[PDB]
């Protein structure tokens, strides 16, 4: 999981990065909440903290 957490730490600036910056006011759950808001309220959350292994 650590590699994916670190790989989210190097985004160049975009509108997604500004929304992620608004939400941190990086563990993966902060990604998933923003993704859930983008995709729709009906679908279920993509990632879960400390269960990235199956």
């Amino acid at each position: 999981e650590e590699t994916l957490c670190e790989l989210y730490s190097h985004l160049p600036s975009c509108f997604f990065l500004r929304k992620l910056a608004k939400r941190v006011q990086v563990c993966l759950s902060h990604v998933s909440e923003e993704v859930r808001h983008l995709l729709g309220s009906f679908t279920q959350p993509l990632y879960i903290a400390s269960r990235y292994k199956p």
């Binding site: 600036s13 500004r18 910056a21 941190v24 006011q25």
Partner: protein, 61 residues
């Protein structure tokens, strides 16, 4: 007339002030991890000079 002073249509001065404060906050947040203030009374006297208003008063006359 007083619904303008209450605020039902947006204004350029407050939108620019909010946008400048938002840009400043964005720059501060990126660091972490000029524009006039708005008048209160002359709001109305500044509203009664735009041409979109005078066209409607002239067509009423």
């Amino acid at each position: 007339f007083p619904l303008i002073y209450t605020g039902f249509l947006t204004f350029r001065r407050d939108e620019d002030i909010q946008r400048q404060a938002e840009r400043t906050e964005q720059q501060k947040l990126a660091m972490e991890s000029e524009l006039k203030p708005l008048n209160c009374s002359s709001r109305l006297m500044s509203f009664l000079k735009s041409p979109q208003v005078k066209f409607y008063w002239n067509i009423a006359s």
